C-alpha cells in the first residue's frame, strides 16, 4: 500500500523540505531588520567605544591611568576609510565610499579566513598598480607621482591608472576590487566576488562607471551560476526584500539590458543610470546592503563534494564550473565596452590582463587559504582568562575579608 513511485515522491518531499528549511533559516536574519544591513556603521558609532576589559589593560588603567579602548569592526573600517590605497587621493568620493564599504565588509565578515591572493599571480607581475605611461614598470611602481599627467593631445593622453586588490577566503576563490582612473574624468569601480568550484553560490558583481564626477552607469548583481539562469530562493527573497527596503521609489523597470547582460543577469539584477543624488544614495545603500547580505549568507555555506556514492553532486559541480566559465566568457566578450578603456595599455597586455586576472577560470587551480579561526580563541581567553589556583586562593582571602569587613 505504498508503491515505488510514492516512495520516490516521499523522498522528494523530504529532500526539498530540507531545502526550504535552509532557505528560510538563511533569510530570517535579514527578514526583521533589513536596514541593519546598511545602518550597521551608524549603529556601531552609536554604540561607541568599548572599554577593553582585559587584565593587562585593567592593570594599565590602575597604574598609569591610561584607558585602552576598542571599536567594532564597522567603525574600524570607517576609521580606515579607503585605507593605504596608492590612488586614494585622485578617486571620486562616491568610489572611495563604495571601496571603503565593500573592503570593510570583506575584512569584517570574512575575518580569520581572508587571505591575500598569491603575489606570484597578480603582484609579482606588477598588476597591483599599473600606469599607462609606464607599462614596463621602469619606475618601480612610483609612476603615479613620478610622472606628471599628459598634456592634451600629447602622446599618452588620456592617462589610465588601475589599482587592484585581490583577496581569497574559505568560500571565495577571488574577491577582486579594481579602480581605474582616466584624465577625461572617467572613473571605474569593478568589484567581483567569486565562489569556489565547490559551492552552489552566485558570483557577486558591481560596476560603477562615472564621467567627470557624474555617475553614468551603476550595476549591482548576484549573477547566477546554474544552467537555468535562476538563483536560489534565499537569494531571490533577499534581493527582492532589499530592493523594496532601499530602492523605495523610482521607476520600476530601470533595466536597459544592453544585449550582453542577458546571459548572466539575475531576474532581480540592478543596472541603472543614476539621475539624482537621491537615486545615487539609494543605489549605494542597496548595493552595500546586498553585499553585506551576500557575505553574511557566505558564512553558513557548505561545499559540495562528489565522487563515490552519488553523481548528482558531480553534475552540480559541473554546472557550477560551466556557470563560472559562462560568466567569465561573457565578461571577456565585453570588448565592445569597458575594454575600450584599455588598448591604451596595449592590446596584447590587455589580453594578458583580462585572461589572467579578474575573469579567470581553471579546473586545476584553486587558490590556497589560511583559515586561522583560533584568534577568536586567543581574544576570548584574553577577555576571560583563568588565573590559577594561587590566584583563586588569594581571591578567596579577599572575598572573606570583604565579607567580614563590609
Amino acid at each position: 500500500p505504498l508503491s515505488p513511485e510514492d516512495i520516490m515522491r516521499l523522498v522528494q518531499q523530504h529532500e526539498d523540505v530540507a531545502a526550504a528549511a535552509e532557505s528560510e533559516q538563511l533569510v530570517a536574519q535579514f527578514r526583521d531588520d533589513p536596514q541593519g544591513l546598511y545602518e550597521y556603521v551608524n549603529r556601531a558609532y552609536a554604540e561607541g567605544p568599548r572599554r577593553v576589559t582585559t587584565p593587562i589593560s585593567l592593570l594599565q588603567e590602575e597604574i598609569t591611568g591610561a584607558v585602552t579602548e576598542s571599536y567594532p569592526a564597522a567603525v574600524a573600517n570607517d576609521i580606515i576609510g579607503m585605507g593605504s590605497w596608492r590612488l586614494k587621493d585622485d578617486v571620486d568620493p562616491v568610489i572611495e565610499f563604495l571601496v571603503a564599504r565593500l573592503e570593510g565588509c570583506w575584512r569584517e565578515i570574512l575575518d580569520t579566513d581572508l587571505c591575500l591572493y598569491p603575489r606570484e599571480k597578480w603582484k609579482e607581475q606588477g598588476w597591483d598598480l599599473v600606469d599607462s605611461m609606464d607599462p614596463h614598470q621602469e619606475l618601480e611602481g612610483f609612476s603615479y607621482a613620478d610622472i606628471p599627467d599628459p598634456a592634451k593631445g600629447e602622446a599618452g593622453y588620456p592617462r589610465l591608472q588601475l589599482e587592484n586588490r585581490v583577496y581569497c577566503s574559505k568560500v571565495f576563490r577571488k574577491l577582486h576590487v579594481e579602480v581605474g582612473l582616466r584624465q577625461d574624468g572617467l572613473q571605474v569601480l569593478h568589484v567581483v566576488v567569486y565562489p569556489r568550484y565547490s559551492y552552489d553560490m552566485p558570483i557577486f558583481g558591481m560596476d560603477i562607471v562615472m564621467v567627470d564626477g557624474r555617475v553614468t552607469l551603476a550595476v549591482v548583481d548576484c549573477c547566477p551560476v546554474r544552467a537555468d539562469l535562476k538563483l536560489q530562493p534565499h537569494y531571490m527573497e533577499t534581493m527582492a526584500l532589499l530592493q523594496r527596503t532601499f530602492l523605495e521609489g523610482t521607476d520600476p523597470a530601470l533595466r536597459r539590458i544592453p544585449e550582453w547582460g542577458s546571459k548572466i543577469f539575475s531576474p532581480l539584477a540592478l543596472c541603472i543610470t543614476p539621475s539624482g543624488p537621491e537615486e545615487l544614495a539609494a543605489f549605494a545603500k542597496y548595493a552595500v546592503a546586498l553585499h553585506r547580505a551576500y557575505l553574511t549568507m557566505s558564512l553558513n555555506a557548505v561545499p559540495v563534494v562528489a565522487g563515490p556514492g552519488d553523481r548528482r553532486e558531480a553534475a552540480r559541480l559541473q554546472e557550477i564550473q560551466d556557470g563560472q566559465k559562462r560568466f567569465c566568457d561573457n565578461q571577456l566578450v565585453n570588448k565592445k565596452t569597458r575594454r575600450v578603456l584599455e588598448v591604451a595599455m596595449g592590446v596584447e597586455w590587455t589580453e594578458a590582463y583580462m585572461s589572467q586576472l579578474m575573469f579567470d577560470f581553471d579546473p586545476k587551480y584553486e587558490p590556497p587559504y589560511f583559515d586561522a579561526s583560533f584568534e577568536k580563541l586567543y581574544t576570548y581567553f584574553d577577555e576571560n582568562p583563568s588565573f590559577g589556583e594561587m590566584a583563586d586562593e588569594a581571591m578567596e582571602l579577599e572575598r572573606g575579608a570583604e565579607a567580614e569587613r563590609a
Partner: peptide, 13 residues
C-alpha cells in the same frame, strides 16, 4: 576653516 574636523567624504544619509 578648521580642517581635520568636518567634511571630506560622500555619505548617502
Amino acid at each position: 576653516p578648521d580642517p581635520y574636523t568636518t567634511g571630506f567624504g560622500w555619505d548617502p544619509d
